[PDB]
Design a protein around this ligand. Structure first.
Ligand SMILES: CC(=O)SCCNC(=O)CCNC(=O)[C@H](O)C(C)(C)COP(=O)(O)OP(=O)(O)OC[C@H]1O[C@@H](n2cnc3c(N)ncnc32)[C@H](O)[C@@H]1OP(=O)(O)O
Ligand SMILES: CC(=O)SCCNC(=O)CCNC(=O)[C@H](O)C(C)(C)COP(=O)(O)OP(=O)(O)OC[C@H]1O[C@@H](n2cnc3c(N)ncnc32)[C@H](O)[C@@H]1OP(=O)(O)O
Lengths: 145, 143
């Protein structure tokens, strides 16, 4: 019931619902049109969504880098519904992210995370991700436009 | 001034990225010029050049939050002898102008915490490390 699969265009509605649940949990805003945009992204772009049943997802983008022949991957969104956490779903999603980007010969996986999100940080650290390069923490700066 | 690099400019861009990595003692892969020539040719990334002394490398990728892309300033560098004279400011100003032509919904930049001079530069030009009272971190795994 919760095996990991690659989302198809017709799955955009389920992905959108999970993203809304994610934003609702963290009291962050949602634009209209998530479903339509996910449908276009899944069909046409260098990006994919993995679904665990209807209870978790991972949204990955692939973009060019001069450092590698393959892309740099970014896990833009990762979410497991609260009642299904601490059961290995997130581990299985992340393992499948690494499996799928390996098919594309991706040179790196990147993930941005809030410092306050200590559970997610411990999860990523325990599954082979680091905040350190050249002996320094790495920070994300943004400007919304 | 600042110009959008062409495939013919791949040698210059590669040289600057090499110089950047040499300055900070970080690894340089082979084939940078050839890879930049391929990347410049395609439609989801671009390089801005300040003469032959500075560059910005920007990627564009999809997001479900906007019709336009999320832009990332994956590399920004001005040659040491030309710093502190507004070149970086001009490059970043042109980054915003070019991604606006793509209706990009956000610009993202990852930077090391120890690069305090670069962070002061980004903060002075409208970038923030804070959301919901929390700093934002980058995690990676090299593959
Ligand atoms: C770019 C971004 O999206 S960054 C923000 C990341 N997303 C979020 O924070 C959203 C809210 N959180 C979540 O959705 C989840 O907390 C996630 C996605 C971070 C992790 O998902 P989960 O399904 O909880 O992960 P999983 O169960 O595999 O592992 C969590 C812990 O449970 C442990 N665990 C696994 N199976 C079991 C089990 N049967 N019994 C008890 N503990 C278990 C794991 O070992 C892990 O511990 P660790 O973090 O100390 O290594
Ligand atoms: C995604 C990334 O590339 S993150 C890393 C960014 N790149 C680097 O740090 C490389 C080293 N530095 C540089 O190449 C340049 O100095 C840049 C790109 C940071 C700024 O370019 P400049 O042409 O110096 O910018 P400009 O003259 O418009 O503004 C000056 C500000 O640049 C910053 N700056 C100047 N020298 C340096 C330096 N050696 N290292 C970092 N930041 C610097 C300071 O904040 C300075 O402001 P101050 O007068 O308060 O010190």
């Amino acid at each position: 019931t919760n095996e990991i699969r690659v989302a198809e265009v017709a799955d955009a509605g389920v992905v959108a619902k999970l993203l809304r649940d994610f934003n609702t949990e963290f009291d962050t805003p949602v634009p209209e049109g998530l479903e339509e945009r996910f449908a276009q992204i899944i069909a046409h772009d260098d990006a994919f969504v993995l679904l665990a049943g209807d209870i978790g997802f991972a949204y990955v983008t692939l973009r060019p880098s001069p450092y590698y022949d393959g892309p740099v991957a970014m896990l833009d969104e990762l979410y497991v519904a609260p009642a299904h956490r601490n059961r290995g779903v997130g581990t299985a999603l992340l393992q499948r992210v690494f499996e799928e980007i390996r098919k594309h010969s991706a040179g790196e996986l990147q993930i941005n995370v809030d410092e306050v999100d200590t559970d997610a940080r411990r999860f990523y650290e325990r599954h082979g991700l680091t905040n350190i390069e050249q002996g320094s923490r790495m920070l994300l700066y943004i400007r919304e436009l």
